């Protein structure tokens, strides 16, 4: 509706709206007529369409009437301790399947099992996870398990072995452009050539972020009230991308090599609010793609950037990390 965000408004409803996950969507569709759906483990980067995919599968399998009575969904917002897993999940799995109505049996396949969707399974403790090993196996004939996670390493080996793994690929401009273009036409958003491709490139495998950026750009254009097409500079500004001029000044200061000047420039730069991750990514792109540096310089800078990114991913101060990275690069 008009009172919902575009990310939720254009959420897939069926399995035919999934764009770049055909390798698993085809298997899921075949399971509709095969009726032998196994335990599933959906893993991949954020914003790839895993929860949407499982919701669409459950809808197409059961119907809006049987969805409530055949699906049990537990996520990180509910207590999922060992006791909860041993009591509630066990009781639901061991229960008999709800009796479908003639309407549902006529218009839906109505598979003879229920589904438990453990979203954000990577947040569950190992002890709690170990309690499901026999639960899934014993009641496989009446219940099926769907574990959705972002880090596959957080799932214990027995559960990964029991579940069938499904990897969701990143959504880039080469496979997710069609959906973004369709959304743009539906919303009557006018954009210049390459704007959607730039949005998808900035998103880096996150269609939700791209949709949010498109919505923000459309809102800005509507508020402007000029009718001009959306450009790429405005999109970059809305995405927090550092201007190329600032990057040029940064690399020139690094090439200068003076510690005091670099420190002063970093102090001035950090007052603008630019995210450290974006700066590091832009610096990595510029330095790696440049042909004016030798093999050793790139060899060292790659490791330096990797270390800086790893340290930043732990939630540290951006100023200190950025200053250290720039100082190290200047001494390469």
């Amino acid at each position: 509706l008009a009172q919902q965000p575009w990310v939720e408004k254009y959420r897939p409803k069926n399995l035919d709206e999934v764009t770049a996950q055909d390798h698993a969507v085809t298997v899921l569709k075949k399971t509709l007529k095969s009726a032998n759906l196994p335990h599933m483990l959906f893993y991949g980067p954020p914003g790839t369409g895993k929860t949407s995919t499982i919701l669409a599968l459950t809808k197409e399998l059961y119907g809006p009437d049987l969805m409530k009575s055949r699906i049990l969904e537990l996520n990180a917002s509910d207590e999922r301790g060992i006791s909860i897993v041993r009591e509630k999940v066990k009781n639901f799995a061991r229960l008999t399947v709800s009796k479908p109505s003639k309407h549902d049996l006529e218009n839906y396949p109505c598979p003879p099992y229920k589904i438990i969707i453990l979203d954000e399974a990577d947040s569950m403790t190992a002890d709690a996870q170990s309690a499901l090993r026999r639960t899934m196996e014993t009641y496989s004939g009446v219940t099926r398990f769907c574990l959705i996670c972002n880090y596959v390493t957080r799932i214990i080996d027995p559960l990964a072995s029991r579940c069938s793994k499904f990897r969701f690929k990143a959504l880039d401009a080469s496979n997710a452009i069609d959906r973004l273009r369709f959304i743009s036409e539906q919303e009557n958003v006018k954009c210049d050539d390459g704007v959607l491709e730039r949005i998808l490139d900035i998103s880096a495998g996150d269609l939700r972020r791209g949709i949010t950026l498109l919505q923000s750009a459309s809102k800005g254009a509507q508020y402007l009230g000029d009718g001009k097409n959306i450009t790429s500079t405005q999109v970059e500004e809305l995405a927090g991308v550092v201007p190329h001029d600032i990057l040029i000044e940064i690399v020139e200061k690094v090439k200068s090599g003076d510690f005091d000047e670099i420190k002063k420039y970093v102090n001035t730069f950090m007052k603008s609010g630019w995210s450290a991750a974006s700066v590091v990514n832009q610096l990595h792109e510029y330095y790696i793609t440049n042909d004016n540096f030798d093999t050793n310089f790139k060899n060292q800078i790659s490791w330096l950037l990797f270390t800086t990114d790893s340290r930043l991913n732990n939630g540290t101060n951006e100023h200190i990390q950025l200053l250290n990275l720039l100082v190290k690069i200047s001494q390469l």
Binding site: Q3, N75, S77, D78, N150, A239, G315, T316, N324
Partner: protein, 352 residues
């Protein structure tokens, strides 16, 4: 009331800096029905909370500024009764779950879902008595939340999208997890320029009848604030109160006590490098930490004061910054702040 609080703007049209951000906020508030979740990030003391309040006032009526404080009771797995101070408004809600430490997740799993799972009674500006809109919840200092709370929020912000909207203000996005960033609309709030800070200070002075011979006075305050506006206003007020409401060209810049203590520590470490000096630094660190001074701020200020020493060379500064970078991550992954501050100080003294 303090000048920093008495002259706070209460509307989007009253903002005096970052006009582009004001235009973006106005564009967002033009059609607030489809407003996505918002995440404001930028330097501290720039006006992120003021801009959020202005946006809320643009969306709802002026009645967003009538605030109340209530107390909420929570129970943990050990039957431990915890109290949370909730700041509420008829049109919006404000919460700071970090005040409960590792128990912040409970607030996500008990309070927010209570508000988002069902409707509200709106007997004002309505005909039926039931609300026909969404509620905006402001989670202050989202970067301080634990990973579990953010993971719990992941589905909460999605399955109640059109009933509740979240506006999260933070000074850094590094602690924020990728799923939360993906689910939020990023808004960058740059710090005000020196000229804008000087103009605001001049307006305050001329509205408070404060004698000022040269405007350059205010300019210095801006160079002493490093982009912060709240610090600038507080420093102006303190200087006016310390100089009989008359600023002079010879008036010194008033620094807070903790900054002076950190400077003493820095110029004691530089001058003396010994185990006894390290013990005295341990005592100083205990004194600093016992009085509600965050460890990260102490480390940052100590590092940036060491790098400002005119006697140290490039190699010493590089070693100091490398050690600071390592020990910042050590602090982020540790509990005892002094256990890492002492290590950083010892490494710095060794490298000198």
């Amino acid at each position: 009331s303090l000048w920093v609080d008495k002259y706070r703007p209460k509307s989007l049209n009253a903002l005096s800096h970052n006009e582009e951000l004001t235009n973006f906020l106005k564009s967002l508030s033009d059609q607030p029905r489809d407003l996505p979740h918002l995440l404001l990030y930028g330097p501290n003391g720039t006006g992120k909370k003021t801009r959020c309040m202005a946006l809320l006032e643009s969306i709802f009526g002026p009645g967003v500024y009538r605030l109340k404080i209530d107390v909420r009771q929570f129970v943990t797995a050990s039957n431990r009764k915890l109290e949370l101070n909730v700041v509420s408004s008829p049109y919006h809600l404000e919460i700071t779950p970090s005040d409960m430490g590792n128990n912040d997740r409970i607030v996500i799993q008990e309070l927010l879902k209570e508000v988002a799972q069902m409707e509200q009674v709106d007997f004002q500006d309505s005909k039926d008595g039931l609300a026909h809109r969404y509620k905006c919840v402001i989670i202050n200092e989202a970067n301080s939340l634990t990973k579990d709370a953010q993971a719990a929020l992941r589905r909460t912000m999605e399955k109640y999208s059109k009933n509740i909207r979240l506006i999260m203000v933070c000074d850094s996005m590094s602690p924020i997890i990728a799923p939360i960033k993906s689910r939020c609309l990023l808004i960058r709030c740059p710090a005000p320029s020196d000229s804008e800070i000087s103009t605001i200070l001049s307006d305050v002075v001329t509205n408070e009848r404060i004698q000022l011979e040269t405007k350059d006075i205010l300019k210095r305050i801006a160079q002493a604030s490093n982009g912060n506006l709240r610090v600038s206003l507080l420093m102006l007020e303190s200087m006016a109160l310390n100089n009989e409401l008359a600023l002079k060209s010879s008036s010194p810049i008033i620094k807070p006590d903790w900054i002076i203590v950190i400077h003493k520590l820095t110029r004691k470490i530089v001058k003396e490098r010994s185990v006894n000096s390290l013990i005295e630094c341990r005592a100083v660190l205990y004194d600093l930490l016992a009085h509600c001074i965050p460890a990260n701020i102490i480390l940052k200020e100590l590092t940036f004061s060491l790098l400002d020493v005119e006697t140290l060379n490039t190699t010493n500064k590089s070693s100091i910054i490398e050690y600071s970078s390592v020990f910042d991550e050590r602090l982020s992954l540790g509990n005892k702040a002094i256990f890492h501050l002492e290590g950083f100080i010892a490494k710095v003294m060794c490298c000198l």
